[PDB]
């Protein structure tokens, strides 16, 4: 047919056959697209009404409620409707600020300046690993993972109560920073969204025109997705990060299209009649899937900034959620973040977990990132001996 488990040799030819196949399957894609657009528009309307009232768009939950298990059904519903969430006070402010200073002292101790939106190529600081295997992070990941329908029919697609250690970096942006930011896009695959057999199953109700039956919270088959090698090696239910510093409004902040089903619009857009044969509305090999005003005006107008944050808060967004980082000139305040996602245990993530453990043991850069291995001979590094039981399970040990 047109699907391919790995990068097709001639991606343009594969794209042309996929369009012919799916357009035939859809029958009247334009009509389907208009209805989906109207539905998405109801959400955009809700969002603008909230913004007009100065009301919060991003769902806001207190970590206190997550910890006590007192998040209401209405709150859970809201997160599922918006596809994102802010966890207030996930970690006390002084703990998050302490982590930031701890990592700086770690860098000084190992003379980083002599051996080396500045993204730090460090992964094994005490702060990073302790935050990752903390009871607070575990409670958050479990809660978020459970917003998904992970058990479908007679199969459990993933363990929502155990998330794998996904070693990532930290980003520090001091006052005065001027950055272009990052254009709107989605991760977890680009061309794969259309050509990967697994994604054809995930988005079956999108490509067959039964949008009413498409549920972005249905986990089935997402765990079978393997991004092309031209990259993320794990299945994430939510991307996310913890604020290491307070973050002020308008200062080049994270924005998202708080509509998880927006991906359906993205998937059908290239199938309309104003799209060149070979083109996929900006999608290109080895690049993140872009979302623009040119191809997705309805979606771009829904981009919504995170609200003001205090160090210790954490923000999360569904794996299909479109996000960006607005540009900033002469940034006020700091913009420090520690990236920590939610990747529930499953065959795919267990395979990466074994690799993570080996990298940790050596203090080397994780496979998904550039091979810099700065920490291989650093002192004060988090080691296997520092792992608590939760950390061990998160590493498939």
Curated annotation (Swiss-Prot):
PANTHER family: DUF1479 DOMAIN PROTEIN (AFU_ORTHOLOGUE AFUA_5G09280), UNCHARACTERIZED PROTEIN YBIU-RELATED
Transmembrane segments: none
Superkingdom: Bacteria
InterPro entries: Gig2-like, IPNS-like_sf
Record-linked SUPFAM superfamilies: Clavaminate synthase-like (SSF51197)
Official protein name in the record: Uncharacterized protein YbiU
Organism: Escherichia coli (strain K12)
Gene3D superfamilies: B-lactam Antibiotic, Isopenicillin N Synthase, Chain (2.60.120.330)
One Pfam family matching this protein: Gig2-like
